[PDB]
Amino acid sequence: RVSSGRDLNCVPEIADTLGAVAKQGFDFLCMPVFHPRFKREFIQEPAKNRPGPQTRSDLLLSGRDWNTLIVGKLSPWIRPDSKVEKIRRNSEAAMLQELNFGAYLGLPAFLLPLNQEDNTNLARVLTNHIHTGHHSSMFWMRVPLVAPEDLRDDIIENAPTTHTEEYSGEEKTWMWWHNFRTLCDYSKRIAVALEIGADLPSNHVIDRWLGEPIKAAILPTSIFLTNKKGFPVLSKMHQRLIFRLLKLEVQFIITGTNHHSEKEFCSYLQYLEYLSQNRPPPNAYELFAKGYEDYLQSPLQPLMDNLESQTYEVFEKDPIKYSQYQQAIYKCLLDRVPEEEKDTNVQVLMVLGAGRGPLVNASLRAAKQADRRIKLYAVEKNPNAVVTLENWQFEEWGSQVTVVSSDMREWVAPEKADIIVSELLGSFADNELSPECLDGAQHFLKDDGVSIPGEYTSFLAPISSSKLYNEVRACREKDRDPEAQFEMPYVVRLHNFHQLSAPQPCFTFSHPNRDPMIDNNRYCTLEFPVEVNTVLHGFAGYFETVLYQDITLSIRPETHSPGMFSWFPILFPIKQPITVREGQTICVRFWRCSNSKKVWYEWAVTAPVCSAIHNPTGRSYTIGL
Amino acid sequence: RVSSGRDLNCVPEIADTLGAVAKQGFDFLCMPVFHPRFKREFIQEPAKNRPGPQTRSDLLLSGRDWNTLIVGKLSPWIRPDSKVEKIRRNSEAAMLQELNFGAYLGLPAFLLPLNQEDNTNLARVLTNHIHTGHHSSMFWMRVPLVAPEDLRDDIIENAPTTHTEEYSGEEKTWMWWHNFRTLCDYSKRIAVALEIGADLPSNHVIDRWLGEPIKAAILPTSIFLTNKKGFPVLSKMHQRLIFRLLKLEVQFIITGTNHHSEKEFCSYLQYLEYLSQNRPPPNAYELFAKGYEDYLQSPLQPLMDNLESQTYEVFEKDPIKYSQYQQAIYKCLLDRVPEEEKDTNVQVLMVLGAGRGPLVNASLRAAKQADRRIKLYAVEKNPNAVVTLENWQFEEWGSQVTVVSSDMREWVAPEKADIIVSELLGSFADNELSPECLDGAQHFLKDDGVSIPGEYTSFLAPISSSKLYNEVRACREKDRDPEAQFEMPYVVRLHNFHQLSAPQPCFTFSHPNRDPMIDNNRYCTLEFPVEVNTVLHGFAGYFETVLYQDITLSIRPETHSPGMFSWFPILFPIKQPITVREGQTICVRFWRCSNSKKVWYEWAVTAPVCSAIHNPTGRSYTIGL
Amino acid sequence: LPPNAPACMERQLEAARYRSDGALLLGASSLSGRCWAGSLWLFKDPCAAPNEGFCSAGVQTEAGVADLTWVGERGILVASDSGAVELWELDENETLIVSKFCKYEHDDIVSTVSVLSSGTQAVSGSKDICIKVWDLAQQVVLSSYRAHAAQVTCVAASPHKDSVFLSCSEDNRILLWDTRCPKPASQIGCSAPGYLPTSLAWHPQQSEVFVFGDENGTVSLVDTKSTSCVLSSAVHSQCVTGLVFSPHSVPFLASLSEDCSLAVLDSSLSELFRSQAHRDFVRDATWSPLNHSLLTTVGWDHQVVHHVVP
Amino acid sequence: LPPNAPACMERQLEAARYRSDGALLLGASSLSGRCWAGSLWLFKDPCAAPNEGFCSAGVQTEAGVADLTWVGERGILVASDSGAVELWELDENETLIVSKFCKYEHDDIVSTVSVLSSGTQAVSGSKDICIKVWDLAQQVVLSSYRAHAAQVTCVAASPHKDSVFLSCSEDNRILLWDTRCPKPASQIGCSAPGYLPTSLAWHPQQSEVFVFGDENGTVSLVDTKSTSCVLSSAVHSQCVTGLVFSPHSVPFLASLSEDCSLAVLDSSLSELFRSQAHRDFVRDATWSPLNHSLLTTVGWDHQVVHHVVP
Ligand SMILES: CSC[C@H]1O[C@@H](n2cnc3c(N)ncnc32)[C@H](O)[C@@H]1O
Ligand SMILES: CSC[C@H]1O[C@@H](n2cnc3c(N)ncnc32)[C@H](O)[C@@H]1O
Incomplete structure (x- = not known):
């Protein structure tokens, strides 16, 4: 349900305070590790020689408490970007001191403010702390949605607040964050503590933060309304944002004094729990996609590789998809055998890549449903899966099904097919080489034969996600090109991201392929109009396929087939993030390239700036033929 | 003098043609490897099955001729970015074919046009050829200063030429180049063949190309004027550009027919030779800097490391610098010993880092010149150099000079100094740790003592050079961070570059250093106004020092000391090039950082975009204490 | 030391304010060590301060001042x-300091x-x-x-x-x-x-x-x-x-x-x-x-x- | 074959132009092989073309056509x-082809x-x-x-x-x-x-x-x-x-x-x-x-x- 902490800038006794906040139901406490007013001098006598202790003892809590219940806070006097040199130097020394203490204590996290535009020296000092011992602990940069200068009451007679709307200006707080994290070179240890105010800004301002590494949301007691019974509550717009933030599973932090003093402070927390339990629940997909959010996976290559038993089991675990296949064959059978010829006719149906036989069973259910007669071939190159097939056929199918242990491109079939059925499609449709496989099989399809599927189309969309950019970047391996991570696709349940433009079709294939000369190579140019300021990090891929006539399957969000939880989209990274201004077009170029040995994708962004061509000659990523 | 080739698009006999151009004095020939009109079909029968040969035989020249005298040319029908798919495919196949033939032949270079804005697919195909066997051979991208659309006669009644000046537009040809080389990921094999027209554009347009990898300049016979005797000649503005291009040592290519048909074609070449021999000659520095142009070197660390004999020899090879030192001491001696006290007085002069004794000898020449009396200490931690010193002192100096084999920070001196003299300065002044060394020595300087030098200041300037960006990038090593190349300074005779802004002071040190509490750490923010469109690749560093009063040394170009050829500037790279639009400010931030063990620089660009902080905690680069 | 007056004044002296009669008001915080609180002190003899025993009145605040x-x-x-x-109020006898409101x-x-x-x-x-x-x-x-x-x-x-x-x-x-x-x-x-x-x-x-x-x-x-x-x-x-x-x-x-x-x-x-x-x-x-x-x-x-x- | 007429016509036929009288003008290039040149041919019997021996006139050009x-x-x-x-000109007898200007x-x-x-x-x-x-x-x-x-x-x-x-x-x-x-x-x-x-x-x-x-x-x-x-x-x-x-x-x-x-x-x-x-x-x-x-x-x-x- 909800993980939540209490923010305090006053801790008389660490013992009683921690106990109090536990009693109130808080999972953890954000507090200073040095007294916020206890300014320290490091250079000038005599204050430099101030007798210690400089703070309270580690001995006052268990190591386990320090490790789990305490988030430290930078003292508010610490100003590393001060224009006053002596303040800058004392702040550099104090910041290192407080960070070193948090690391001494084994704190899981530490809060640092981004409360102005220039945090260069603060970033330089934090980067130094990070590059001093490899440690796990998080740095939560406390940034507001709305800068305090843009929140101030219009009560200065000779300094009126600007009522002129400034699109870019209202987004200034995101740029504070972006510049800081860029200077600190996207450290995985540096995340956002997003501070929410009584006045939410424009949606565009909230959307800015979509793909950012938000670990915490800070709710001041101030922003809370009062119900008729005087309980704290939130505006519907505030509530909508909480629902958005619950999907990102952030920790909520309550800051400020009890302004609902008719009642206890658990009242604020009780409200959040109330919103959590009363969120619209997640669909089957969302229960399927449970631990997979932003988890990068290698795309399966069921041609080059032999899939494991449990891989086929997951393919089979989505019955709806096979009901679709059953329906396509059912329809195709009725279109091909008139009711007058039902008992004379018997169509040769060939499953090309039969795995453990779900399409074989769907083909059989389809024939009994159509009340029409079929002979079956089950073709499968994975001899491990042929074992499953041959046990099924001996025990159940009988001689109606001829299991063929062969590559469909090599197989010399005893007779031509009326219908070939296949599930040779990846998350980017042709990325398992369905085109090359079915091309090699089509010589044994009758001149009027049907391929199910008859067609498939890949779709791309530009996406922003600093989170996934960092996940990819983290996939550097020894003994290879240090940037190969970025020149390969990943299957991933894209979660913490922003889709910058509607998906556009990329590559399309049709079966049978009538072309007298056939080329499965492709070159596509796409233009994505972008209506927001953002950073491009990569391209989401999806697919649609026409099984038969109106019966389709899709993972494209606008046309998504129901129940097809089986099946996350693909991600094409780029090496360098690209800034996109509102109103600009992202131009991406994709190639499908081939040898006798290998098929691969190459891609480049040509607008609003050029990237390098990614994966030239399959140097980082190929698909085996 | 001049390396020059002949460009031809007509070669009836390769034998006679090559012989002809040799007789005319050309070093090499640019020609097609397939007949420029011989369009080839790869997909459609029957033209696909055209009987061969597809071109003329390798047997028609020696391997040596192919290797040295022949630059190949892409056939002009080859249009990989054609909007017509069949033309795109045949062009992809033909381009690979012609490139593969040039590689078959061992051609040293191959010409490809950039004659329009979209060369995406052409770049994709060239990148593929480059990623197919590691080969040395160059690709010369033929780009004009002025696009042919902007050169066309104003002779279309209903399509008038725009007489409205467009700053960015007139630079469109550089962007063609930039986008191509970005897509091909700065391959070192890809360079510019710059084509010059009868009408030169604005200087700004020429300046665009300053730091670019120009290997060849193409002069059409068209652009040549005629002298009274009817010889071909060039405008002064054309001539100025040739003088500019001679400094970059490009190969000149003559294209087009003889338009001075009263005379032979060697007349064009004879003109270039005439300009070469009649260029203003290079200063001593330029004769010194001869083979060092854009040669990246490790900055010397004479504290952490013991310099070799020949390193000291090069330091000594510039007498002017020591005459300056002699002058500073001479002056300081007269300011300190009144003519009345000349014979009573005797000043203790200590050379701190005496190397092989040039400052010892300068100190002695200074005392005889001033007719004043000095006792000398020669302090040197390099025991190899102490050998040179102790032979000098035994054989020549005698007991006036006490050689001390010690670190000046550790040495317990028998008496306090009137004057300490040192040459502890690198190309970025404090980069050899003169500050820390002289700080450690100052306890043995009299309360009124003089340090020569008394002051030094480092200067930075933003620079563009795609050439040096590629040199740095090429310095990846195994067993270290794959981007450490970019997080360290290089000493280099910067040659093929553009300085984007006037140098600004960075860090300054003074000796003696009176500060009651001393900090040699620094944080500096610099703002460089930029008046051109460009790409930032790094920062040039220089220094000035005040030896004494008005006597200085400088490698800063505006204040450069005469004869100080001894001494190239420094380069601070950045990992990612940064686009700068005319009128934008480059903001760079530099830190001088320290431990007890190490001193280092960290740096970041904060405008017009943020970089990563470079060299955080000296992870890539440190200077030993 | 007075009744209700702490044994020990916190080290960090924050405020000193003389009344019209010449009596001295002292504020102090504990800015380090286990307990981070404060104190209010009245010294009718200003020269005795900061010594706690010779104070006219003293109290402990929940937190620092x-x-x-x-x-x-x-x-x-x-x-x-x-x-x-x-708001803290002096006694009629001014022997102790009492919280009016917080x-x-x-x-x-x-x-x-x-x-x-x-x-x-x-x-x-x-x-x-x-x-x-x-x-x-x-x-x-x-x-x-x-x-x-x-x-x-x-x-x-x-x-x-x-x-x-x-x-x-x-x-x-x-x-x-x-x-x-x-x-x-x-x-x-x-x-x-x-x-x-x-x-x-x-x-x-x-x-x-x-x-x-x-x-x-x-x-x-x-x-x-x-x-x-x-x-x-x-x-x-x-x-x-x-x-x-x-x-x-x-x-x-x-x-x-x-x-x-x-x-x-x-x-x-x-x-x-x-x-x-x-x-x-x-x-x-x-x-x-x-x-x-x-x-x-x-x-x-x-x-x-x-x-x-x- | 005529006097001044090449033994062999280049393989790549570029141009075919009938005169008013019905005589055939042929242009050809050598677009591959050692020598990259061209030829001009006149066939007063159009049905004999491209055979060189049965030509009214033929010449060799320095380069392709x-x-x-x-x-x-x-x-x-x-x-x-x-x-x-x-500019190439036909003979009075039209038996050979001669360069007027180049x-x-x-x-x-x-x-x-x-x-x-x-x-x-x-x-x-x-x-x-x-x-x-x-x-x-x-x-x-x-x-x-x-x-x-x-x-x-x-x-x-x-x-x-x-x-x-x-x-x-x-x-x-x-x-x-x-x-x-x-x-x-x-x-x-x-x-x-x-x-x-x-x-x-x-x-x-x-x-x-x-x-x-x-x-x-x-x-x-x-x-x-x-x-x-x-x-x-x-x-x-x-x-x-x-x-x-x-x-x-x-x-x-x-x-x-x-x-x-x-x-x-x-x-x-x-x-x-x-x-x-x-x-x-x-x-x-x-x-x-x-x-x-x-x-x-x-x-x-x-x-x-x-x-x-x-
Ligand atoms: C059910 S997932 C797709 C199935 O097709 C099989 N497959 C893929 N390519 C071929 C091929 N060319 N010939 C036969 N089976 C194939 C795979 O081994 C997998 O079981
Ligand atoms: C002549 S170049 C500078 C000289 O100073 C010497 N040097 C540098 N640092 C020190 C030091 N701390 N003590 C003594 N010599 C030094 C070097 O070995 C070099 O010969």
Whole structure:
């Protein structure tokens, strides 16, 4: 349900305070590790020689408490970007001191403010702390949605607040964050503590933060309304944002004094729990996609590789998809055998890549449903899966099904097919080489034969996600090109991201392929109009396929087939993030390239700036033929 | 003098043609490897099955001729970015074919046009050829200063030429180049063949190309004027550009027919030779800097490391610098010993880092010149150099000079100094740790003592050079961070570059250093106004020092000391090039950082975009204490 | 030691305020060690302070004391680390100090308090960026102003005008307030935007002149009438924490800095006196009502120093 | 074989032009192998061609022949790979072919030549992007125009107006020229900017109508009067290399493509005839003066084909 902490800038006794906040139901406490007013001098006598202790003892809590219940806070006097040199130097020394203490204590996290535009020296000092011992602990940069200068009451007679709307200006707080994290070179240890105010800004301002590494949301007691019974509550717009933030599973932090003093402070927390339990629940997909959010996976290559038993089991675990296949064959059978010829006719149906036989069973259910007669071939190159097939056929199918242990491109079939059925499609449709496989099989399809599927189309969309950019970047391996991570696709349940433009079709294939000369190579140019300021990090891929006539399957969000939880989209990274201004077009170029040995994708962004061509000659990523 | 080739698009006999151009004095020939009109079909029968040969035989020249005298040319029908798919495919196949033939032949270079804005697919195909066997051979991208659309006669009644000046537009040809080389990921094999027209554009347009990898300049016979005797000649503005291009040592290519048909074609070449021999000659520095142009070197660390004999020899090879030192001491001696006290007085002069004794000898020449009396200490931690010193002192100096084999920070001196003299300065002044060394020595300087030098200041300037960006990038090593190349300074005779802004002071040190509490750490923010469109690749560093009063040394170009050829500037790279639009400010931030063990620089660009902080905690680069 | 008086005064001396009769009000915080709280002390013999046993009255506050002010002769208004402004009242016998009210209205540390000329109202400033106006008798907030865009460093009520007070913030604003204006705040100061303003003191007689100290140790004299920056001196090597006018007809001005020094300046901002007595931060100054040439400083070195000014 | 006539005709047949009497002019290039040159051939018996021994006259050119045109009945104007336009003259006995002039004025391959209606002037087009106008009798360039911004594909003189000619370029421009205008060129064509224009032919009788072929195999009929794109047909699977009108009162139009096919179209652009005879690129077409139903094609397959059109 909800993980939540209490923010305090006053801790008389660490013992009683921690106990109090536990009693109130808080999972953890954000507090200073040095007294916020206890300014320290490091250079000038005599204050430099101030007798210690400089703070309270580690001995006052268990190591386990320090490790789990305490988030430290930078003292508010610490100003590393001060224009006053002596303040800058004392702040550099104090910041290192407080960070070193948090690391001494084994704190899981530490809060640092981004409360102005220039945090260069603060970033330089934090980067130094990070590059001093490899440690796990998080740095939560406390940034507001709305800068305090843009929140101030219009009560200065000779300094009126600007009522002129400034699109870019209202987004200034995101740029504070972006510049800081860029200077600190996207450290995985540096995340956002997003501070929410009584006045939410424009949606565009909230959307800015979509793909950012938000670990915490800070709710001041101030922003809370009062119900008729005087309980704290939130505006519907505030509530909508909480629902958005619950999907990102952030920790909520309550800051400020009890302004609902008719009642206890658990009242604020009780409200959040109330919103959590009363969120619209997640669909089957969302229960399927449970631990997979932003988890990068290698795309399966069921041609080059032999899939494991449990891989086929997951393919089979989505019955709806096979009901679709059953329906396509059912329809195709009725279109091909008139009711007058039902008992004379018997169509040769060939499953090309039969795995453990779900399409074989769907083909059989389809024939009994159509009340029409079929002979079956089950073709499968994975001899491990042929074992499953041959046990099924001996025990159940009988001689109606001829299991063929062969590559469909090599197989010399005893007779031509009326219908070939296949599930040779990846998350980017042709990325398992369905085109090359079915091309090699089509010589044994009758001149009027049907391929199910008859067609498939890949779709791309530009996406922003600093989170996934960092996940990819983290996939550097020894003994290879240090940037190969970025020149390969990943299957991933894209979660913490922003889709910058509607998906556009990329590559399309049709079966049978009538072309007298056939080329499965492709070159596509796409233009994505972008209506927001953002950073491009990569391209989401999806697919649609026409099984038969109106019966389709899709993972494209606008046309998504129901129940097809089986099946996350693909991600094409780029090496360098690209800034996109509102109103600009992202131009991406994709190639499908081939040898006798290998098929691969190459891609480049040509607008609003050029990237390098990614994966030239399959140097980082190929698909085996 | 001049390396020059002949460009031809007509070669009836390769034998006679090559012989002809040799007789005319050309070093090499640019020609097609397939007949420029011989369009080839790869997909459609029957033209696909055209009987061969597809071109003329390798047997028609020696391997040596192919290797040295022949630059190949892409056939002009080859249009990989054609909007017509069949033309795109045949062009992809033909381009690979012609490139593969040039590689078959061992051609040293191959010409490809950039004659329009979209060369995406052409770049994709060239990148593929480059990623197919590691080969040395160059690709010369033929780009004009002025696009042919902007050169066309104003002779279309209903399509008038725009007489409205467009700053960015007139630079469109550089962007063609930039986008191509970005897509091909700065391959070192890809360079510019710059084509010059009868009408030169604005200087700004020429300046665009300053730091670019120009290997060849193409002069059409068209652009040549005629002298009274009817010889071909060039405008002064054309001539100025040739003088500019001679400094970059490009190969000149003559294209087009003889338009001075009263005379032979060697007349064009004879003109270039005439300009070469009649260029203003290079200063001593330029004769010194001869083979060092854009040669990246490790900055010397004479504290952490013991310099070799020949390193000291090069330091000594510039007498002017020591005459300056002699002058500073001479002056300081007269300011300190009144003519009345000349014979009573005797000043203790200590050379701190005496190397092989040039400052010892300068100190002695200074005392005889001033007719004043000095006792000398020669302090040197390099025991190899102490050998040179102790032979000098035994054989020549005698007991006036006490050689001390010690670190000046550790040495317990028998008496306090009137004057300490040192040459502890690198190309970025404090980069050899003169500050820390002289700080450690100052306890043995009299309360009124003089340090020569008394002051030094480092200067930075933003620079563009795609050439040096590629040199740095090429310095990846195994067993270290794959981007450490970019997080360290290089000493280099910067040659093929553009300085984007006037140098600004960075860090300054003074000796003696009176500060009651001393900090040699620094944080500096610099703002460089930029008046051109460009790409930032790094920062040039220089220094000035005040030896004494008005006597200085400088490698800063505006204040450069005469004869100080001894001494190239420094380069601070950045990992990612940064686009700068005319009128934008480059903001760079530099830190001088320290431990007890190490001193280092960290740096970041904060405008017009943020970089990563470079060299955080000296992870890539440190200077030993 | 008195009944209800702590055995031990916290080390960090925050405030020193003489009453009209010459009795000394002391505020102290515990800014390190296990327990981070504060204390209020009354010394009818000022020379005994800081020694706890020789105190007229003393009490323990839940949290540290950021700022203090006398409310008339028996009242003590407190800026707490807790976000509370608390009202403490002296005893009839003045033998103990009792909490009148403690209101948690500020979302962060209360940094600064001032009593307005009425004596029935006070202004609080906080790190939460808000400035609040207090009805002392009804113990409530009349107004809460988010004028500033960073933590409020100082609030100083006008001597004689109950609607007027200065504020300064790390947003680099000095605000002149009049609660009678529908837009109550007005941005005032030097020609040049300069170093952050740290300390404020109205001229006692001249109702439209004040002085401010900056984070760079500069002290400045300001005429609202000119809205011009009259006079500035570089008095300190560090931040000016406090500025206190003498009770003299032509007042002397006490300047206290984190440079651990006290300076006393003429009305031309020239320096008469300098004391290096403290060996830590100098937190407050109060001139004796009885002898106007006597000035008491307190510091985080726990020293109560009595200066004789020339 | 005749005196001065080569033993062997180069494989790549570039041009076929019937004279008024029915004699056949042949241009050929060597586009592969050791020697990259060309040849000019006269066949008074057209059915003997391409066989060299049965030729009326033949000569060797220094370089390949990109384009050709009859100049009256004894003159041959040549577009050379060398950047030269050369004038070749038939013998009195017409037994040999002799160079009248060879001028190296073009900086790259001369791609295209046309004789203007006067017969004393011609227009050249080149890959160097320039279009030149030639005084044939004084053998000089009257004018040189850089109108285009890419290689010039075709130049075609008006039938009856000595100042008027079309040009087309890979800059996607069709230019209508009149040397009597101070700005001589005018940009003409379809509503839609479309596929690069490759081939041009004026209507023989209608002095303000022409047709153009594109790189996508579309043939288009254009009225300068409408400046509108009247009619277009998809005639070829590849580039339209050439367009030739029949001598008929209502002319038929011969269409030749890199698709190695010939098509013959009515004036409505509908297709009457189609020949797959060639097994390489179809380079030219000339209708017989003698039998207007006879049409000779040449190809890079070295085939001289004689078609009977329905
Ligand atoms: C059910 S997932 C797709 C199935 O097709 C099989 N497959 C993929 N390519 C071929 C091929 N060319 N010939 C036969 N089976 C194939 C795979 O082994 C997998 O079981
Ligand atoms: C002549 S180049 C500078 C000289 O100073 C010497 N040097 C550098 N640092 C020190 C030091 N701390 N003590 C003594 N010699 C030094 C070096 O070995 C070198 O010969």
